[PDB]
Design a protein around this nucleic acid. Sequence first.
RNA 1: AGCGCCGCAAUUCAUGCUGCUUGCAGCCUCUGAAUUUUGUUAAAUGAGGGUUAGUUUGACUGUAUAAAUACAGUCUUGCUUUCUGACCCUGGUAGCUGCUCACCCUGAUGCUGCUGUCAAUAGACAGGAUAGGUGCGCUCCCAGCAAUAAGGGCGCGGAUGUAC
Lengths: 164, 602, 87
Amino acid sequence: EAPDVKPWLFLIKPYEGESLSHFLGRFRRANHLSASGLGTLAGIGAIVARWERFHFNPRPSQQELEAIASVVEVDAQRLAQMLPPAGVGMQHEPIRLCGACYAESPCHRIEWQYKSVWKCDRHQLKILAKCPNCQAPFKMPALWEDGCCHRCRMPFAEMAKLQK
Amino acid sequence: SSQITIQARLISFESNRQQLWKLMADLNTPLINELLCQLGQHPDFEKWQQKGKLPSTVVSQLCQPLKTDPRFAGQPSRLYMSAIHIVDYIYKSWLAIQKRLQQQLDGKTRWLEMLNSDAELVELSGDTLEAIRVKAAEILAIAMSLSKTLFDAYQETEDIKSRSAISYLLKNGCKLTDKEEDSEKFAKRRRQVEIQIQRLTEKLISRMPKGRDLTNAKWLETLLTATTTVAEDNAQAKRWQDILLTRSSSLPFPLVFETNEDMVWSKNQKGRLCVHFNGLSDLIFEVYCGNRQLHWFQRFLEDQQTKRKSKNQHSSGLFTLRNGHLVWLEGEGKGEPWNLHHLTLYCCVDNRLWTEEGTEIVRQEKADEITKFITNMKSDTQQALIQRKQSTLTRINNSFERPSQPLYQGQSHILVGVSLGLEKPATVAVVDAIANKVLAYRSIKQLLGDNYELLNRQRRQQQYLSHERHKAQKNFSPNQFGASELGQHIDRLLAKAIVALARTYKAGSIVLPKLGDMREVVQSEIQAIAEQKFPGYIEGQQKYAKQYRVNVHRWSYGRLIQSIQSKAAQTGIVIEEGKQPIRGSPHDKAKELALSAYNLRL
Amino acid sequence: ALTQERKQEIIVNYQVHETDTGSADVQVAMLTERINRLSLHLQANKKDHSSRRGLLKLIGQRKRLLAYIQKDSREKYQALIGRLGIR
RNA sequence: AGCGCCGCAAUUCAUGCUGCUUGCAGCCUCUGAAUUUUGUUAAAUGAGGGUUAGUUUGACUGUAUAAAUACAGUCUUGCUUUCUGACCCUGGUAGCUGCUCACCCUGAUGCUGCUGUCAAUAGACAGGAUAGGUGCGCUCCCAGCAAUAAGGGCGCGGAUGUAC
Ligand SMILES: [Mg+2]
Ligand SMILES: [Zn+2]
Ligand SMILES: [Zn+2]
């Protein structure tokens, strides 16, 4: 062993509005974990691959968030802030993006999936629901490694000027 | 199980059939629907669920003001009475189901609390395992019904040592065990109980009895709504879809005639047996039956004529006919419904009333029951009830002069055990219990004899017809069929074979296993395994052992038990219930089932 | 089934402009024609569960489109449902 | 290949047979059990759809008998089903109407699979349950298709505030 070392893992700081799908994707990339791997590591199994698609029948339970809060050092109350608050309706399929936010903070925001959200009040821009250059839909936020459209390679920060 | 049904087609000219159809479909079934609706809204409905019992008269009281409502007013008195009986039996059924399910949920919730692992039992007792093992040995030596006695002992003994010792003693099947607890087999056994509690909790969200709307007005108005109106949200549109997919009820509720003399039999000049019903004597229906049942319908006239010749000095309490159901059977093709559908009468008879010796059995059963009633029962109408009971008790002594057939005599020491299994539906052992020897085994193949090929046919058709339905569903084709009638045929062939063997060896009884609810056991066992194998993957869990779970849901152990009970009662062979051992082959299970039922006689 | 002439007449009547062929208003007008004809069919053909499967799809499709239009503009939405005769 | 079924053959055996001693000891023809092989000119299974108020499976009484049942007489009705035979089909003419498809890749409990005249394209005509593969059959396998399982890729047009 390395003497006086504590068993450790690569951590990531969650951004102020980062979605759980985006967060788990970064944590998985930081540790080169497959989606099945993190679920086995937390012991919740295939559930992680389901959450990364925003498939929330059922929602992330107290048990499973506290389980993920054992391998991720982020506490379960902060993990619950990566999800819609109680009774806020959300949509999983059309993945959406502000772009002007992504130039400031490279994360998907869970509020971009709310059924009540359509503009960024900070930027006063209509949030995108597909790539404005090539019309390809955005991939699940767990897969936003490159920070660009997977088809035409336009960076999300440039898509800010193609909004509203 | 001496009650059986015999049936016949009822034939009449069209205006009689049309008049009856309109009474049933336009008045009687709407009345039943209204009674079901009002009864499900009654302020005592929630306390009826707690008792599990309906008040004896509440349906009759609700029907009284409806008998003169313009929606329902046009019916004979016995059709209102029939509607009352339909509704009353529906809720007697439904409240009995809910009551037992609730007791099951409460019982297993207590078991989940008192199912503690030895690691938990060490902390919760504060004693070493050997110390609680000794304390369990004492508590067993006092409780020496043992299971219930330990469940009784657990509740009020707040002493956590004895309470834990009872928990340890119950975990092992009411006995001591030296061997160590396999922690994963315990965790699985705990998980099974949680699944069972959850599945019981879900079954207790049963719907109230839905009725039969034959107009389907709700479907058409929902169609007009959903096509011309914006849905306020997804939940309204889903409720619209759920209505639009609901299939229409074609047929009214049958009529029920609980008074056997409300069917009045006659023979027309063309020599055919005829019947008319109290309140509808102008509608003569002609009996069209198989000869294999004709002797019953002839008996109904002879019983009626006997009591008329004696000026009612006989009792209809010994009439072979018990009650009738009047049913429309769905016809193939097209027409007006009174022409398309076939009017059918189902008569309950008690098979014992065929013979004179069996009638004497029923007479004593009637006399004891009525003498008990008259003694315990002691208003003007309640005194009239006593007088009718006393008239019955007097008149059942008058004989109908029925065919004499000496009752079956079976040796008390000879038993037939019937092992029931998923792979081998029945296996029998004839045991001479005082000799402790098997007189005969028979396999499933020997029981079916020349019919044994039907058993492979059933398996083959169940596969084939399921796949043809699966293919037909994707086309929205109506041609969806199944093997239920072949399965019923097989169970009746087995029942006759088992009883014939019992007669041949002069067995005193047939022993059948208390299987319990095999489907909920298997379903919770497999789910507990699958949740370990496919953690967090529901579809993987549901695919796991899917065909075994299907096979267990098709296993017709209840239908086979029922067929055996009926055939044994018709020959006067006693049915006994025993515990089927899990060890051994179907032959050994049948032997030990038989011998345990003998030893369990006390 | 729908004729090309009735189809193109729906396009022309609900178009936002002469080359608009796919705005949500045109889509709900197309679906409203289909739903009206199929409702008349199912009133007569209750056992046509194959065709009933289509209705539940078509009603859902129009429900999603109208909900989309309504939160673009209640003025356009209310005007549109009034023209189509939808409550 | 895999899986199910079918018989075949083989071993062991008792619910089979033999015996006096009636509880035991032999045996494997019969009648069965335990699943062990194997697909053969074998013996068994075999699933395209449809067609009768079809026949036999009854009731009572007497006689006989160890039950099981059997014989004789009288009466008889047609219900709801399960098989075995035999026979008929591969449908027609108008309406209404769903689903599917820009295109490409993968291929699903997807679709199709018979015979023989004719016939390059196209299918028609006449046969017909012998209907792709094995003893038989499958959602398996083979061949073609696959838009009408899921997915993935990627055009121009409309729309682009989450619907498409
Ligand atoms: Mg959507
Ligand atoms: Zn923004
Ligand atoms: Zn792009």
